[PDB]
Amino acid sequence: KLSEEQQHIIAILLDAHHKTYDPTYADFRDFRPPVRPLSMLPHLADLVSYSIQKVIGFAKMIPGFRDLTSDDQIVLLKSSAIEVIMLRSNQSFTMDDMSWDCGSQDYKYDVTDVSKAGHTLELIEPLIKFQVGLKKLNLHEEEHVLLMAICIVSPDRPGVQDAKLVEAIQDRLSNTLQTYIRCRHPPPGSHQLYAKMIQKLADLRSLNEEHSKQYRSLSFQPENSMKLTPLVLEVFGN
């Protein structure tokens, strides 16, 4: 029925998100200007770098995350980073015109802008479909932050060491989510809600997979890799 601890976990994650997601998008002004070949890469690279920083800050506040080894923490962030960014970006995504609207026209990204970052439809289409499907769930902010935390602490991540501990931490987050839906999400919106959210995590592994291929191809050419940031290169691989 949602113990005090489970409510505690949610309150912690909500605050962690509030401290790492600025809906005013004021910081975007510090990024290299968006330009509409690969004219949007400098801007989106900066956007992503900033986002990596915010996802890291969010992750450190995940109850239990701090108990993992420095190595495990590193492994989880490198593997989930792109996934959590895609996930958190749903907050700026708008089905009005299938674009990521971050406060203004300059900061409103659509399919062509992503295309101008070096990506193809093989990633973009399923990415928009994902955003569309996630939006369709109309998740409570509570469910949104729990999903990002669950995504981060995944036991099957490649290179994971203490998988047992990682699984234990995630399980506590999963049980928190499952119970929240049952007790706080009214039907019909709660119908199969948990399974649907886990399915989104499966979609993200696929998206992660495709993004990594296009990123390696894109970052294989020095001139492109030259337009990224130091953090992006370190986290997404060099």
Partner: peptide, 11 residues
Amino acid sequence: KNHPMLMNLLK
């Protein structure tokens, strides 16, 4: 395994 910036942000 040698992720300076990422490690610093996690400390």
